[PDB]
Protein backbone atom coordinates (compact mmCIF):
# COMPACT_ATOMS: atom_id res chain seq x y z
CA UNK A 1 0.00 0.00 0.00
CA UNK A 2 1.44 3.41 -1.21
CA UNK A 3 -0.19 6.80 -1.88
CA UNK A 4 -0.82 7.21 -5.64
CA UNK A 5 0.90 10.58 -6.10
CA UNK A 6 4.02 9.39 -4.21
CA UNK A 7 3.98 6.00 -5.97
CA UNK A 8 4.01 7.88 -9.34
CA UNK A 9 6.87 10.24 -8.22
CA UNK A 10 9.07 7.16 -7.46
CA UNK A 11 8.10 5.56 -10.78
CA UNK A 12 9.19 8.80 -12.55
CA UNK A 13 12.40 8.98 -10.46
CA UNK A 14 13.27 5.29 -11.11
CA UNK A 15 12.80 5.80 -14.90
CA UNK A 16 15.25 8.78 -14.78
CA UNK A 17 18.03 6.46 -13.39
CA UNK A 18 19.80 4.66 -16.35
CA UNK A 19 20.45 1.48 -14.29
CA UNK A 20 16.70 0.90 -13.58
CA UNK A 21 15.32 2.76 -16.71
CA UNK A 22 15.00 -0.44 -18.83
CA UNK A 23 12.92 -2.44 -16.21
CA UNK A 24 9.26 -3.36 -17.15
CA UNK A 25 6.45 -1.04 -15.85
CA UNK A 26 5.05 -3.82 -13.54
CA UNK A 27 8.49 -4.19 -11.78
CA UNK A 28 8.93 -0.37 -11.43
CA UNK A 29 5.43 -0.39 -9.75
CA UNK A 30 6.43 -3.25 -7.38
CA UNK A 31 9.69 -1.38 -6.44
CA UNK A 32 7.75 1.92 -6.04
CA UNK A 33 5.37 0.04 -3.62
CA UNK A 34 7.95 -2.04 -1.62
CA UNK A 35 10.57 0.74 -1.21
CA UNK A 36 10.80 2.92 1.94
CA UNK A 37 11.56 6.66 1.59
CA UNK A 38 14.04 7.42 4.46
CA UNK A 39 15.34 10.90 5.27
CA UNK A 40 18.73 11.52 6.90
CA UNK A 41 20.28 14.61 8.42
CA UNK A 42 23.75 15.88 7.54
CA UNK A 43 26.26 13.80 9.60
CA UNK A 44 24.20 10.64 9.98
CA UNK A 45 25.72 7.29 9.14
CA UNK A 46 23.39 5.68 6.56
CA UNK A 47 25.72 2.61 6.66
CA UNK A 48 28.56 1.76 9.11
CA UNK A 49 31.46 -0.43 7.93
CA UNK A 50 31.53 -3.82 9.67
CA UNK A 51 27.78 -3.84 10.43
CA UNK A 52 25.44 -6.51 9.06
CA UNK A 53 23.34 -5.30 6.11
CA UNK A 54 20.17 -6.44 4.31
CA UNK A 55 19.04 -3.23 2.44
CA UNK A 56 19.96 -1.43 -0.86
CA UNK A 57 19.72 2.40 -1.28
CA UNK A 58 19.06 4.76 -4.19
CA UNK A 59 19.75 8.47 -3.41
CA UNK A 60 16.70 10.55 -4.46
CA UNK A 61 18.00 13.79 -2.76
CA UNK A 62 21.34 15.10 -1.48
CA UNK A 63 24.87 13.65 -1.34
CA UNK A 64 26.74 11.14 0.84
CA UNK A 65 30.39 10.46 1.61
CA UNK A 66 31.82 6.96 1.25
CA UNK A 67 34.84 6.17 3.52
CA UNK A 68 36.62 2.96 4.44
CA UNK A 69 39.02 2.06 7.23
CA UNK A 70 41.77 -0.40 6.10
CA UNK A 71 43.03 -1.36 9.64
CA UNK A 72 41.30 -0.39 13.00
CA UNK A 73 44.49 1.55 13.97
CA UNK A 74 44.41 3.46 10.60
CA UNK A 75 43.07 6.63 8.97
CA UNK A 76 39.60 6.31 7.33
CA UNK A 77 40.14 6.77 3.55
CA UNK A 78 37.78 8.97 1.50
CA UNK A 79 36.58 6.90 -1.50
CA UNK A 80 33.92 9.03 -3.18
CA UNK A 81 30.81 11.24 -2.87
CA UNK A 82 27.54 9.90 -4.37
CA UNK A 83 24.51 12.04 -5.33
CA UNK A 84 20.95 11.94 -6.72
CA UNK A 85 20.45 8.88 -8.99
CA UNK A 86 23.44 6.99 -7.46
CA UNK A 87 22.97 3.84 -5.38
CA UNK A 88 24.84 1.80 -2.70
CA UNK A 89 24.60 -1.09 -0.22
CA UNK A 90 24.56 -3.99 -2.73
CA UNK A 91 27.94 -5.56 -1.71
CA UNK A 92 26.54 -6.97 1.62
CA UNK A 93 23.68 -8.59 -0.43
CA UNK A 94 26.21 -10.13 -2.94
CA UNK A 95 29.05 -12.01 -1.16
CA UNK A 96 29.98 -10.07 2.02
CA UNK A 97 27.80 -10.64 5.21
CA UNK A 98 29.21 -7.26 6.31
CA UNK A 99 29.14 -3.59 5.20
CA UNK A 100 32.49 -2.87 3.47
CA UNK A 101 32.45 0.96 3.85
CA UNK A 102 30.72 3.81 5.69
CA UNK A 103 28.07 5.93 3.87
CA UNK A 104 27.53 9.25 5.68
CA UNK A 105 24.94 11.93 4.73
CA UNK A 106 26.82 15.09 3.59
CA UNK A 107 23.65 17.31 3.62
CA UNK A 108 19.84 16.62 3.89
CA UNK A 109 19.40 13.21 2.19
CA UNK A 110 16.54 11.04 1.05
CA UNK A 111 17.10 7.42 0.01
CA UNK A 112 14.63 4.96 -1.46
CA UNK A 113 15.46 1.88 0.62
CA UNK A 114 14.86 -1.64 -0.82
CA UNK A 115 15.00 -4.92 1.21
CA UNK A 116 17.30 -7.88 0.20
CA UNK A 117 14.37 -10.02 -1.11
CA UNK A 118 12.94 -7.16 -3.26
CA UNK A 119 16.54 -6.40 -4.44
CA UNK A 120 16.80 -9.99 -5.77
CA UNK A 121 13.21 -10.54 -6.93
CA UNK A 122 12.69 -7.11 -8.61
CA UNK A 123 16.14 -5.62 -9.50
CA UNK A 124 17.63 -9.11 -10.04
CA UNK A 125 21.17 -8.06 -9.27
CA UNK A 126 24.06 -5.67 -9.93
CA UNK A 127 26.96 -8.26 -9.87
CA UNK A 128 27.66 -7.36 -13.57
CA UNK A 129 26.14 -3.77 -13.26
CA UNK A 130 28.04 -2.44 -10.15
CA UNK A 131 31.45 -3.39 -11.70
CA UNK A 132 30.63 -1.43 -14.91
CA UNK A 133 28.45 1.47 -13.42
CA UNK A 134 31.21 2.43 -10.94
CA UNK A 135 35.00 2.53 -11.37
CA UNK A 136 37.56 1.38 -8.73
CA UNK A 137 37.53 4.26 -6.18
CA UNK A 138 39.64 2.13 -3.72
CA UNK A 139 42.42 1.84 -6.39
CA UNK A 140 42.17 5.60 -7.11
CA UNK A 141 42.31 6.45 -3.38
CA UNK A 142 45.40 4.14 -2.94
CA UNK A 143 47.20 5.68 -6.04
CA UNK A 144 46.55 9.21 -4.62
CA UNK A 145 47.96 8.24 -1.20
CA UNK A 146 50.97 6.50 -2.87
CA UNK A 147 51.58 9.48 -5.20
CA UNK A 148 51.84 11.85 -2.17
CA UNK A 149 54.13 9.41 -0.27
CA UNK A 150 56.51 8.94 -3.26
CA UNK A 151 56.58 12.70 -4.22
CA UNK A 152 58.13 13.45 -0.78
CA UNK A 153 61.05 10.94 -1.16
CA UNK A 154 64.69 11.70 -2.12
CA UNK A 155 67.59 9.44 -3.20
CA UNK A 156 69.00 10.00 0.38
CA UNK A 157 66.02 8.02 1.92
CA UNK A 158 67.24 4.67 0.47
CA UNK A 159 69.71 1.90 1.34
CA UNK A 160 70.98 -0.55 -1.31
CA UNK A 161 70.41 -4.08 0.04
CA UNK A 162 71.36 -6.43 -2.81
CA UNK A 163 71.31 -6.79 -6.63
CA UNK A 164 68.29 -8.27 -8.35
CA UNK A 165 69.87 -8.34 -11.79
CA UNK A 166 72.03 -6.67 -14.44
CA UNK A 167 70.70 -6.02 -17.95
CA UNK A 168 72.36 -4.75 -21.12
CA UNK A 169 71.91 -1.04 -20.20
CA UNK A 170 71.65 -0.99 -16.34
CA UNK A 171 71.59 -2.69 -12.88
CA UNK A 172 68.42 -3.42 -10.81
CA UNK A 173 69.13 -3.15 -7.06
CA UNK A 174 66.93 -4.13 -4.17
CA UNK A 175 66.51 -0.91 -2.15
CA UNK A 176 64.94 -0.27 1.24
CA UNK A 177 63.67 2.86 2.97
CA UNK A 178 66.00 3.88 5.86
CA UNK A 179 62.99 4.86 8.07
CA UNK A 180 60.76 1.76 7.22
CA UNK A 181 63.17 -1.22 6.82
CA UNK A 182 60.25 -3.62 5.94
CA UNK A 183 59.47 -1.52 2.76
CA UNK A 184 61.70 -2.73 -0.15
CA UNK A 185 61.65 -1.76 -3.87
CA UNK A 186 63.48 -2.64 -7.13
CA UNK A 187 65.60 0.39 -8.21
CA UNK A 188 66.70 0.33 -11.91
CA UNK A 189 69.85 2.52 -12.28
CA UNK A 190 70.72 3.56 -15.88
CA UNK A 191 73.93 5.39 -16.94
CA UNK A 192 72.92 8.56 -18.86
CA UNK A 193 76.01 8.29 -21.17
CA UNK A 194 75.12 4.66 -22.01
CA UNK A 195 71.51 5.65 -23.06
CA UNK A 196 72.85 8.30 -25.55
CA UNK A 197 75.52 5.99 -27.12
CA UNK A 198 73.03 3.06 -27.65
CA UNK A 199 70.34 5.45 -29.11
CA UNK A 200 67.69 4.39 -26.45
CA UNK A 201 66.66 7.98 -25.35
CA UNK A 202 63.11 7.52 -26.84
CA UNK A 203 62.83 3.91 -25.57
CA UNK A 204 63.64 5.07 -21.96
CA UNK A 205 61.27 8.11 -22.22
CA UNK A 206 58.38 5.90 -23.47
CA UNK A 207 59.11 3.12 -20.91
CA UNK A 208 58.87 5.69 -18.00
CA UNK A 209 55.68 7.37 -19.38
CA UNK A 210 53.83 4.05 -19.92
CA UNK A 211 55.00 2.20 -16.78
CA UNK A 212 54.62 5.18 -14.47
CA UNK A 213 51.10 5.93 -15.80
CA UNK A 214 50.02 2.24 -15.64
CA UNK A 215 48.01 1.11 -12.60
CA UNK A 216 47.42 -2.68 -12.93
CA UNK A 217 48.02 -5.59 -10.58
CA UNK A 218 49.38 -7.60 -13.59
CA UNK A 219 51.97 -4.88 -14.48
CA UNK A 220 55.04 -4.09 -12.31
CA UNK A 221 54.51 -0.56 -10.85
CA UNK A 222 56.98 2.27 -11.58
CA UNK A 223 56.27 4.52 -8.57
CA UNK A 224 58.54 7.30 -9.70
CA UNK A 225 61.96 8.19 -11.01
CA UNK A 226 64.88 10.29 -9.71
CA UNK A 227 67.93 11.64 -11.53
CA UNK A 228 71.38 13.01 -10.68
CA UNK A 229 74.39 14.14 -12.85
CA UNK A 230 75.24 10.72 -14.42
CA UNK A 231 72.23 8.40 -13.76
CA UNK A 232 68.47 7.89 -14.06
CA UNK A 233 66.76 5.98 -11.20
CA UNK A 234 63.48 4.10 -11.59
CA UNK A 235 61.75 3.15 -8.32
CA UNK A 236 59.67 0.02 -8.99
CA UNK A 237 57.66 -2.64 -7.18
CA UNK A 238 60.01 -5.50 -6.04
CA UNK A 239 58.70 -8.88 -7.32
CA UNK A 240 60.69 -11.44 -5.24
CA UNK A 241 59.14 -14.66 -6.61
CA UNK A 242 61.59 -14.59 -9.54
CA UNK A 243 61.53 -14.48 -13.35
CA UNK A 244 59.12 -16.95 -15.10
CA UNK A 245 61.94 -17.96 -17.62
CA UNK A 246 64.21 -19.39 -14.81
CA UNK A 247 61.23 -21.29 -13.27
CA UNK A 248 60.39 -22.72 -16.80
CA UNK A 249 64.08 -23.65 -17.43
CA UNK A 250 64.13 -25.50 -14.03
CA UNK A 251 60.81 -27.40 -14.41
CA UNK A 252 61.29 -27.98 -18.22
CA UNK A 253 57.60 -27.26 -19.02
CA UNK A 254 54.40 -26.22 -17.15
CA UNK A 255 51.21 -28.24 -16.81
CA UNK A 256 48.01 -27.09 -18.51
CA UNK A 257 46.49 -25.53 -15.31
CA UNK A 258 49.85 -23.77 -14.43
CA UNK A 259 50.19 -22.29 -17.95
CA UNK A 260 46.50 -21.17 -17.74
CA UNK A 261 47.07 -19.11 -14.59
CA UNK A 262 50.10 -17.30 -16.15
CA UNK A 263 48.34 -16.80 -19.52
CA UNK A 264 45.34 -15.30 -17.61
CA UNK A 265 47.75 -12.82 -15.82
CA UNK A 266 48.93 -11.73 -19.33
CA UNK A 267 45.33 -11.55 -20.66
CA UNK A 268 44.55 -9.14 -17.76
CA UNK A 269 47.67 -6.99 -18.39
CA UNK A 270 46.75 -6.91 -22.15
CA UNK A 271 43.02 -6.13 -21.43
CA UNK A 272 44.32 -3.16 -19.32
CA UNK A 273 46.97 -1.88 -21.84
CA UNK A 274 44.78 -2.42 -24.93
CA UNK A 275 41.88 -0.42 -23.28
CA UNK A 276 44.38 2.57 -23.12
CA UNK A 277 45.52 2.19 -26.74
CA UNK A 278 48.94 0.85 -25.60
CA UNK A 279 50.73 -1.98 -27.43
CA UNK A 280 53.24 -4.03 -25.38
CA UNK A 281 55.29 -5.82 -28.14
CA UNK A 282 57.75 -7.68 -25.88
CA UNK A 283 55.93 -10.65 -24.45
CA UNK A 284 58.21 -13.61 -23.62
CA UNK A 285 58.84 -15.70 -20.44
CA UNK A 286 61.77 -13.41 -19.36
CA UNK A 287 59.36 -10.42 -19.24
CA UNK A 288 57.02 -12.15 -16.73
CA UNK A 289 58.09 -11.85 -13.10
CA UNK A 290 56.44 -13.47 -10.07
CA UNK A 291 55.69 -11.46 -6.98
CA UNK A 292 56.16 -13.14 -3.49
CA UNK A 293 52.63 -14.69 -3.77
CA UNK A 294 53.23 -16.34 -7.19
CA UNK A 295 51.18 -13.81 -9.20
CA UNK A 296 52.88 -13.02 -12.59
CA UNK A 297 53.35 -9.37 -13.80
CA UNK A 298 54.69 -7.76 -17.08
CA UNK A 299 58.01 -6.00 -16.37
CA UNK A 300 59.85 -4.61 -19.50
CA UNK A 301 58.20 -1.69 -21.45
CA UNK A 302 61.08 -0.78 -23.81
CA UNK A 303 59.05 -1.70 -26.98
CA UNK A 304 55.65 -0.61 -25.59
CA UNK A 305 53.89 2.34 -27.28
CA UNK A 306 50.71 4.41 -26.99
CA UNK A 307 49.28 3.96 -30.53
CA UNK A 308 45.60 4.82 -29.88
CA UNK A 309 42.58 3.09 -31.44
CA UNK A 310 42.02 2.10 -35.08
CA UNK A 311 45.57 2.93 -36.23
CA UNK A 312 48.82 1.00 -36.93
CA UNK A 313 52.50 1.50 -35.97
CA UNK A 314 55.55 0.65 -38.10
CA UNK A 315 58.59 -0.08 -35.89
CA UNK A 316 60.31 -3.50 -36.15
CA UNK A 317 60.92 -4.78 -32.57
CA UNK A 318 60.49 -7.75 -30.22
CA UNK A 319 62.26 -11.09 -29.65
CA UNK A 320 62.71 -13.19 -32.85
CA UNK A 321 60.61 -16.17 -31.60
CA UNK A 322 57.65 -13.93 -30.49
CA UNK A 323 57.56 -11.33 -33.26
CA UNK A 324 54.28 -11.43 -35.40
CA UNK A 325 54.48 -11.93 -39.26
CA UNK A 326 53.35 -8.28 -40.10
CA UNK A 327 56.21 -7.02 -37.86
CA UNK A 328 58.72 -9.36 -39.64
CA UNK A 329 57.36 -8.21 -43.01
CA UNK A 330 57.34 -4.49 -41.92
CA UNK A 331 53.73 -4.01 -43.11
CA UNK A 332 52.45 -2.08 -40.07
CA UNK A 333 50.87 -3.52 -36.92
CA UNK A 334 48.39 -2.83 -34.16
CA UNK A 335 47.47 -4.44 -30.75
CA UNK A 336 46.62 -7.73 -32.52
CA UNK A 337 50.45 -8.31 -32.71
CA UNK A 338 50.20 -8.86 -28.88
CA UNK A 339 47.56 -11.63 -29.30
CA UNK A 340 49.92 -13.42 -31.73
CA UNK A 341 52.65 -13.33 -28.97
CA UNK A 342 50.20 -14.71 -26.38
CA UNK A 343 49.77 -17.88 -28.54
CA UNK A 344 53.58 -18.24 -28.73
CA UNK A 345 53.74 -17.84 -24.91
CA UNK A 346 51.13 -20.54 -24.26
CA UNK A 347 53.03 -22.93 -26.61
CA UNK A 348 56.45 -22.22 -24.96
CA UNK A 349 55.05 -22.56 -21.40
CA UNK A 350 53.38 -25.93 -22.22
CA UNK A 351 56.40 -27.51 -23.99
CA UNK A 352 59.48 -25.57 -22.84
CA UNK A 353 60.24 -24.48 -26.48
CA UNK A 354 58.66 -21.82 -28.70
CA UNK A 355 56.87 -23.16 -31.82
CA UNK A 356 59.08 -21.34 -34.37
CA UNK A 357 62.85 -21.63 -33.73
CA UNK A 358 65.90 -21.53 -36.04
CA UNK A 359 69.68 -21.45 -35.27
CA UNK A 360 69.73 -17.64 -35.83
CA UNK A 361 67.04 -14.82 -36.07
CA UNK A 362 66.79 -14.85 -39.89
CA UNK A 363 65.96 -18.62 -39.93
CA UNK A 364 63.45 -18.14 -37.06
CA UNK A 365 61.65 -15.40 -39.15
CA UNK A 366 61.45 -17.76 -42.14
CA UNK A 367 59.89 -20.53 -39.96
CA UNK A 368 57.36 -17.96 -38.48
CA UNK A 369 56.27 -16.97 -42.02
CA UNK A 370 55.41 -20.65 -42.89
CA UNK A 371 52.82 -20.35 -40.06
CA UNK A 372 51.49 -22.39 -37.11
CA UNK A 373 49.89 -25.12 -39.35
CA UNK A 374 53.38 -26.38 -40.42
CA UNK A 375 54.34 -26.95 -36.77
CA UNK A 376 53.81 -30.42 -35.24
CA UNK A 377 52.17 -29.88 -31.87
CA UNK A 378 53.36 -32.33 -29.13
CA UNK A 379 50.42 -34.58 -27.95
CA UNK A 380 50.86 -33.10 -24.38
CA UNK A 381 49.26 -29.84 -25.65
CA UNK A 382 45.52 -30.26 -24.86
CA UNK A 383 43.10 -29.94 -27.82
CA UNK A 384 41.57 -26.72 -26.31
CA UNK A 385 45.08 -25.27 -25.65
CA UNK A 386 46.08 -26.08 -29.29
CA UNK A 387 42.79 -24.58 -30.51
CA UNK A 388 43.36 -21.27 -28.63
CA UNK A 389 47.07 -21.20 -29.79
CA UNK A 390 45.94 -21.62 -33.43
CA UNK A 391 43.17 -18.92 -33.04
CA UNK A 392 45.74 -16.45 -31.57
CA UNK A 393 48.49 -17.24 -34.16
CA UNK A 394 46.41 -16.49 -37.31
CA UNK A 395 48.60 -14.99 -40.05
CA UNK A 396 45.92 -12.39 -40.89
CA UNK A 397 45.82 -9.90 -37.94
CA UNK A 398 42.09 -9.27 -38.62
CA UNK A 399 41.24 -12.97 -37.85
CA UNK A 400 43.10 -13.16 -34.48
CA UNK A 401 41.07 -13.94 -31.33
CA UNK A 402 41.19 -10.82 -29.13
CA UNK A 403 40.90 -8.57 -32.23
CA UNK A 404 37.32 -9.64 -33.18
CA UNK A 405 33.98 -7.91 -32.20
CA UNK A 406 34.16 -8.56 -28.41
CA UNK A 407 37.90 -7.81 -28.04
CA UNK A 408 39.75 -9.60 -25.19
CA UNK A 409 36.41 -11.15 -23.89
CA UNK A 410 36.63 -13.67 -26.80
CA UNK A 411 39.99 -14.92 -25.36
CA UNK A 412 38.65 -14.92 -21.79
CA UNK A 413 35.50 -16.87 -22.89
CA UNK A 414 37.47 -19.51 -24.94
CA UNK A 415 36.76 -23.22 -24.06
CA UNK A 416 40.36 -23.52 -22.55
CA UNK A 417 39.34 -21.01 -19.81
CA UNK A 418 36.10 -22.91 -18.77
CA UNK A 419 36.03 -23.06 -14.96
CA UNK A 420 38.90 -20.48 -14.61
CA UNK A 421 38.09 -17.95 -11.87
CA UNK A 422 38.70 -14.54 -13.54
CA UNK A 423 37.20 -12.54 -10.59
CA UNK A 424 39.29 -14.46 -8.02
CA UNK A 425 42.36 -13.69 -10.19
CA UNK A 426 41.44 -9.96 -10.41
CA UNK A 427 40.79 -9.98 -6.56
CA UNK A 428 43.98 -11.91 -5.67
CA UNK A 429 42.16 -14.79 -3.91
CA UNK A 430 42.95 -17.43 -6.56
CA UNK A 431 45.78 -19.75 -5.46
CA UNK A 432 48.82 -19.58 -7.85
CA UNK A 433 50.18 -22.87 -9.29
CA UNK A 434 53.76 -22.19 -8.03
CA UNK A 435 54.11 -20.70 -4.50
CA UNK A 436 57.58 -19.00 -4.32
CA UNK A 437 59.77 -19.22 -1.17
CA UNK A 438 60.50 -15.62 0.00
CA UNK A 439 62.14 -15.59 3.45
CA UNK A 440 61.77 -11.78 3.94
CA UNK A 441 61.44 -8.37 2.12
CA UNK A 442 65.21 -8.67 1.39
CA UNK A 443 65.25 -12.25 -0.02
CA UNK A 444 66.79 -12.16 -3.56
CA UNK A 445 67.45 -15.98 -3.57
CA UNK A 446 64.91 -16.52 -6.45
CA UNK A 447 67.31 -14.54 -8.83
CA UNK A 448 70.61 -16.03 -10.31
CA UNK A 449 74.21 -14.65 -10.00
CA UNK A 450 65.56 14.00 -23.12
CA UNK A 451 65.99 13.38 -19.32
CA UNK A 452 64.22 16.62 -18.09
CA UNK A 453 61.05 14.82 -16.71
CA UNK A 454 63.10 12.08 -14.92
N1 LIG B 1 60.57 -4.91 -10.48
C1 LIG B 1 61.47 -5.89 -10.40
N2 LIG B 1 61.47 -6.67 -9.29
C2 LIG B 1 62.38 -7.64 -9.19
N3 LIG B 1 63.34 -7.99 -10.06
C3 LIG B 1 63.31 -7.20 -11.15
C4 LIG B 1 62.44 -6.15 -11.39
N4 LIG B 1 62.70 -5.57 -12.62
C5 LIG B 1 63.71 -6.27 -13.09
N5 LIG B 1 64.13 -7.27 -12.25
C6 LIG B 1 65.21 -8.23 -12.48
O1 LIG B 1 66.40 -7.54 -12.80
C7 LIG B 1 66.88 -7.98 -14.09
C8 LIG B 1 67.64 -6.86 -14.76
O2 LIG B 1 67.18 -6.67 -16.11
P1 LIG B 1 66.70 -5.30 -16.78
O3 LIG B 1 65.29 -4.93 -16.46
O4 LIG B 1 67.82 -4.27 -16.54
O5 LIG B 1 66.80 -5.77 -18.30
P2 LIG B 1 66.80 -7.21 -18.97
O6 LIG B 1 65.69 -8.07 -18.51
O7 LIG B 1 68.19 -7.83 -18.74
O8 LIG B 1 66.69 -6.83 -20.51
P3 LIG B 1 67.72 -6.39 -21.65
O9 LIG B 1 69.13 -6.78 -21.27
O10 LIG B 1 67.20 -7.11 -22.91
O11 LIG B 1 67.54 -4.87 -21.85
C9 LIG B 1 65.63 -8.52 -14.78
O12 LIG B 1 65.93 -9.42 -15.86
C10 LIG B 1 64.93 -9.22 -13.62
O13 LIG B 1 65.59 -10.44 -13.29
N1 LIG C 1 33.70 -1.08 -0.49
C1 LIG C 1 33.25 -0.05 -1.21
N2 LIG C 1 31.97 0.31 -1.13
C2 LIG C 1 31.68 1.40 -1.88
C3 LIG C 1 32.54 2.12 -2.68
N3 LIG C 1 31.86 3.15 -3.30
C4 LIG C 1 30.62 3.03 -2.91
N4 LIG C 1 30.45 2.00 -2.02
C5 LIG C 1 29.16 1.54 -1.49
O1 LIG C 1 29.18 1.66 -0.08
C6 LIG C 1 28.43 0.55 0.45
C7 LIG C 1 28.62 0.23 1.91
O2 LIG C 1 27.79 -0.96 2.11
P1 LIG C 1 28.11 -2.23 1.24
O3 LIG C 1 29.41 -2.84 1.60
O4 LIG C 1 26.98 -3.19 1.41
O5 LIG C 1 28.10 -1.75 -0.26
C8 LIG C 1 28.91 -0.58 -0.44
C9 LIG C 1 28.87 0.06 -1.83
O6 LIG C 1 27.61 -0.10 -2.45
C10 LIG C 1 33.88 1.70 -2.78
O7 LIG C 1 34.77 2.25 -3.43
N5 LIG C 1 34.16 0.60 -1.99
UniProtKB/Swiss-Prot annotation:
Residues that hold ATP according to the record: 164-172, 188
Domain (AGC-kinase C-terminal) ranges: 418-454
GO CC aspect terms: acrosomal vesicle; cytoplasm; cytosol; Golgi apparatus; nucleoplasm; plasma membrane; sarcolemma
Phosphothreonine modifications at: 313
Tissue specificity of this protein: Primarily expressed in lung and placenta.
Domain Protein kinase residue range list: 158-417
MF GO annotations: ATP binding; calcium channel regulator activity; cGMP binding; cGMP-dependent protein kinase activity; identical protein binding; mitogen-activated protein kinase p38 binding; protein kinase activity; protein serine kinase activity
Binding positions (3',5'-cyclic AMP 2): 89-92, 99-100, 134
Recorded superkingdom: Eukaryota
Domain notes: Composed of an N-terminal leucine-zipper domain followed by an autoinhibitory domain, which mediate homodimer formation and inhibit kinase activity, respectively. Next, two cGMP-binding domains are followed by the catalytic domain at the C-terminus. Binding of cGMP to cGMP-binding domains results in a conformational change that activates kinase activity by removing the autoinhibitory domain from the catalytic cleft leaving the catalytic domain free to phosphorylate downstream substrates. Heterotetramerization is mediated by the interaction between a coiled-coil of PRKG1 and the leucine/isoleucine zipper of PPP1R12A/MBS, the myosin-binding subunit of the myosin phosphatase.
Entry's family note: Belongs to the protein kinase superfamily. AGC Ser/Thr protein kinase family. cGMP subfamily.
Subunit field text: Isoform alpha: parallel homodimer or heterodimer and also heterotetramer. Interacts directly with PPP1R12A. Non-covalent dimer of dimer of PRKG1-PRKG1 and PPP1R12A-PPP1R12A. This interaction targets PRKG1 to stress fibers to mediate smooth muscle cell relaxation and vasodilation in responses to rises in cGMP. Isoform beta: antiparallel homodimer. Part of cGMP kinase signaling complex at least composed of ACTA2/alpha-actin, CNN1/calponin H1, PLN/phospholamban, PRKG1 and ITPR1. Interacts with IRAG1. Forms a stable complex with ITPR1, IRAG1, and isoform beta of PRKG1.
Protein name: cGMP-dependent protein kinase 1
Species assigned in the record: Homo sapiens
Source lineage: Eukaryota, Metazoa, Chordata, Craniata, Vertebrata
Span of the entire protein shown here: 204 to 671 of 671
